[PDB]
Design a protein around this ligand. Sequence first.
Ligand SMILES: [Cl-]
Ligand SMILES: [Cl-]
Ligand SMILES: [Cl-]
Ligand SMILES: [Cl-]
Lengths: 216, 217, 218, 216
Amino acid sequence: ASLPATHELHIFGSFNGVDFDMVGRGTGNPNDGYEELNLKSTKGALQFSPWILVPQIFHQYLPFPDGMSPFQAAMKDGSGYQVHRTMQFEDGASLTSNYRYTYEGSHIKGEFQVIGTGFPADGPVMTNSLTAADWCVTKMLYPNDKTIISTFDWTYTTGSGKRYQSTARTTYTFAKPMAANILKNQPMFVFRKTELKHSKTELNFKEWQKAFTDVM
Amino acid sequence: MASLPATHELHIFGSFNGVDFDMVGRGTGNPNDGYEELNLKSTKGALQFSPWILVPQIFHQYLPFPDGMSPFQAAMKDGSGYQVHRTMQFEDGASLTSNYRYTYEGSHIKGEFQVIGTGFPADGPVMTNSLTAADWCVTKMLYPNDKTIISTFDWTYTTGSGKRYQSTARTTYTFAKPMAANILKNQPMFVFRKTELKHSKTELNFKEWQKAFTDVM
Amino acid sequence: NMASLPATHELHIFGSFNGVDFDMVGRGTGNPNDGYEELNLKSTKGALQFSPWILVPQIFHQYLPFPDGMSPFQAAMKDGSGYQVHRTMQFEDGASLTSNYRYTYEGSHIKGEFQVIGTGFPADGPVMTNSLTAADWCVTKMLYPNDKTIISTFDWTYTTGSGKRYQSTARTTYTFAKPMAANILKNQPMFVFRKTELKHSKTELNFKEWQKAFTDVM
Amino acid sequence: ASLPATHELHIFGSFNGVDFDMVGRGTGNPNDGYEELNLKSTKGALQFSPWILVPQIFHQYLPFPDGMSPFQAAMKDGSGYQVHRTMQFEDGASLTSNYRYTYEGSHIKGEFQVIGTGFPADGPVMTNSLTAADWCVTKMLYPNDKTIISTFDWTYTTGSGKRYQSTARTTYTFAKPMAANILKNQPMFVFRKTELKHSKTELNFKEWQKAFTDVM
Ligand SMILES: [Cl-]
Ligand SMILES: [Cl-]
Ligand SMILES: [Cl-]
Ligand SMILES: [Cl-]
């Protein structure tokens, strides 16, 4: 019906075969790409660094340079989209996820399944040694009118000073075609910053986004 | 009643390019030589994609090792079991991720497989139903710790045009209890496999042969 | 002494594509205050049997300024210690393109020796059929795992005559003889937005590049 | 014009921008794939683990199950082939190389250029922590009559107990078309074992090879 004002997320799955589950609510601004979110565990203490859930934890808040993003258009007309993300880490770990949304006016309900495996017991994720996520640029292309393929190199800083790297690849599938003005402008880049304050069981997340085809 | 498997059943489901699919069926196998065969039928009408893309998605509990039980077999016997997480990244940009869960009762396996595929082009061999066969394949397995197997292979199909359709496969196995020392000593462990698939748009018959080895010579 | 940011450069670029040798030589200029470069190259061994677009971005980061001052490439030229470049590119159709760049400096002038080896480009692919029409505008990500190394990554795509893009994954390692300055090392990651243009025949090309480094667009 | 009995190698290039150069002589058996090689450094002590020159340091010794490999056939008629190898390591290092050959009867002369970068100072290569190369299966496909694409996951055991991994990819380009009996029989696998006895300045290398399409 309209652009998003609020949202809620049920995020669940497993890391190294041990189940996790978090729920919570959030808000954001569709005019500038800002979004905020609180999450609490429903199954006790998290076994892994909560930073590994960034960027898992809402592009319906992202505007484009000259109008609505395809994500925003898909929310307004109700046809929507599905997300499918893969992340391969330097130390052999793999993190795959799928996002499903439903829309109630200006409210979004997220159901995000997230499966992580192969994270070494002594690596930065399982030892809670991640400190921050690097600022990041995503490259988006449109191989057809109902598909976005997004790529970025994702890196955390760790307590040792070494970075922890992964190669991210995200596919968006739309039920209806994206508008002609979106498809004409390829590639579309998105710069993003994130912040996360976390405990063993709870986290508060913030994101800022800016889309651009050109910086000159 | 602990045993190696004689029969299995599968519920396999998920989506390809945002379109849901669901199949169910039953199979048998020989855990002395890695043979298995499976019949599946669709529960949501005709499949929108090449049934070959469900191989190798569609049971390593049938695989023996050269010196004795595989960790897959050992985890079935004692009932502690394992989970499977597979990622396949295709040459044309498509991605196929999946997650396998099992339950056991004696010599019978019940499989619940979730499979999500996206980014398969409209004119690619998956969506045009142009995959003709799966190449015979060698998997490499390593054990980074006593409860994890990392499996890698280069997965290729033949197509109608003669061009092969390629993907890079990575599979993680996560066990509830430690694998035995006789398993962990032999690294890398390689597995040579062959597959056959007869299919319509609603039904398929799958066969697989397997042979594990550390040394060809 | 003549320690300087670059005004001019020359390039000898050579190696092979699908086992057939090629060799080009030429001269160029640029503006190290805004990242602009222009380069003219001519073949010394006949017609190029591959799309000249496959030599982008092979065909000078000494022209790139950073937002707050010199880039490490500029600083390495200014003091003469310099750097080596090692680039790998893996293409969607299974082709492989690896290269190594060596430089010498005389004041504001750069001499480049670039070795470039391409293999596995299919006979009916867009490179060997001269079907590449342009290179997409592109954002590179740079990180510094130590004081003498830069690791760079980008997803590199061309438009083609068929209408569908030709993709590769690019990874570049820069190795510096002396440590990079602390102010450079503090600002990570450093992104670089770039545009390119290429006019070409089978034996000659005119290349243009525009660059803009940034840690933040907001 | 002959199958190989002996060979010599000049291997050179750099690791992390530092030049290296080795020369030496070897023998092998073209009827079973065995080859042995001894090399000496010409620029003093090597600054890296000599294990990182495996598998860099002669498929002209490899037979196929139905006769000559394409590598053997290319030597026997003199048309030959070029090799182009890329290896991407788990800690961010890259190793690329190019091999050229000339033939003098049953004697091969190899000129191999090897460039390695991004090997961290505390990684297994630069600390000399590699203990052995894992036994390995290569997969070979022929996308056309003059090209072979070789893939393998390459791992060393180390002194820490953790393996050191890379993803290896090799392209062979032939001057003449390979024979029909090769092109139809895809994929071709090759199982190999290696042994290395090394010092800072000298090494003895051994390799055993076996090509197969089916082990049932
Ligand atoms: Cl994304
Ligand atoms: Cl597997
Ligand atoms: Cl770069
Ligand atoms: Cl090889």
